[PDB]
Design a protein around this nucleic acid. Structure first.
Ligand code: CA
Ligand code: CA
Ligand code: NA
Lengths: 236, 245
DNA sequence: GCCGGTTAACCGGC
DNA sequence: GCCGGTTAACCGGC
């Protein structure tokens, strides 16, 4: 992580001291590496004005996996112009991107209202993560990027920060990730609760996640009969 | 439908309306309020009015009995603690996962309206209409309690496009869920098991009774669930086994 | 034309 | 404590 080293600094400037308000901090203390996902894409294409067409521009990523996680559609990529730049997207994989010397940190910020009942938010699609692990293995890309999370807790007429949390997805035990199939097949968890005791290699994590994903896929399929078929059979 | 008789006018008044550069639902509410003041309510407003007129009824248990309908209780009520803690000083407010956007009621009959805004400037994408599971439970409760002439679930689509520093409405569509062919409803399991369709495209030729609609939907639901189960193996299991064996 | 996955984030049952 | 369903629409591959 590029943020981990300066976590204390961020935590001390947030607690009490809005959404993406952390981006400001990062874009000032790491202005050299901080980007919104859409800003990184514009930056990458502006730097190579000689490369046109989506097929060519996609090659700019130099990584089938990163291409998969960060790129926009073919049309959007081909239609990309210097006078027609990319804008933020609700569907974007990451909130903030930190890249240095060909290594990437996909950072997601999660805001939690410590006043309401605890309800783990959608973290990332378990399916997208499976395709990611598959691409990591197929292309042997095990030392290219990390997916990390920064949690910001908040709470009379103003909403101030009370604490923060930071965790790395790849440091968590794969089989411990809760996949909520109904909730758009999303992994869900509060950052503060995310396990960080995995000790294996990045390759072992990917294989372990795939076994977990496949197993949960089987379990969900069977459970659908139990909850969506059995109780309604008597009406038909 | 209660808004049906005055639909042509809603359509005319809505086309042209603008919002500061989703909120069109509030404008929909506005008109209905001025044209059907006594039948129009936000879902939370309806709940507040019901409890306000029965101040002596306290506790979630007693308050739940005020709905005098298992199906309506299921579709409209807030949780037990929320119902327990309600008070004139602690009223209900909008809730993200409430079933309906607007309720129109008259003489014990209910119309649950869900406004569906649509950005007409982009590639058509059928939005989440309602949970296929919530709908199945609803049909099951209708059958168990014989409530087949109590309520309707309808949709009002508001099409809009960017026009300067605001969004403007270019057209609208209205359709009724119970007039559609149940077996043709698209259930997108990944998308929170939601039924998906464009109001403008929903068929309206069902020829059976409400009871028949419920049974037919239940048949469709169960069949699609069975298919999804097996389908999950082909899409989420088979393609990744090569990485764990 | 056809088809379905993704983000953001949120209560409430027992 | 443990567990999971719901609303809002929305996009891009072949
Ligand atoms: Ca996020
Ligand atoms: Ca709506
Ligand atoms: Na809905």
């Amino acid at each position: 992580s590029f943020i981990k080293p300066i976590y204390q600094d961020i935590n001390s400037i947030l607690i009490g001291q809005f959404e993406k308000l952390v981006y400001k901090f990062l874009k000032e203390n790491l202005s050299d590496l901080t980007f919104k996902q859409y800003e990184y894409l514009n930056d990458l294409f502006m730097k190579n004005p000689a490369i046109i067409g989506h097929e060519a521009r996609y090659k700019l990523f130099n990584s089938p996996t990163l291409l998969f996680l960060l790129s926009r559609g073919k049309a959007a990529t081909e239609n990309w112009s210097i006078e027609n730049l990319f804008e933020e997207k609700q569907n974007d994989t990451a909130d903030i991107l930190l890249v240095k010397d060909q290594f990437y940190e996909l950072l997601d910020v999660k805001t939690r209202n410590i006043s309401k009942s605890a309800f783990a938010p959608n973290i990332i699609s378990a399916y997208k993560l499976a395709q990611t692990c598959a691409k990591m293995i197929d292309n042997k890309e095990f030392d290219l990027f990390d997916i990390n999370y920064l949690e910001v807790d908040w709470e009379g007429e103003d909403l101030v920060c009370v604490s923060t949390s930071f965790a790395e997805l790849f440091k968590s035990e794969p089989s411990e990730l809760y996949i909520n199939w109904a909730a758009a097949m999303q992994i869900q968890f509060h950052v503060r609760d995310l396990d960080q005791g995995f000790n294996g290699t990045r390759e072992e994590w990917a294989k372990s996640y795939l076994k977990h994903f496949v197993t949960q896929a089987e379990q969900r399929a069977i459970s659908m009969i139990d909850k969506f078929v059995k109780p309604f059979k008597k009406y038909i």
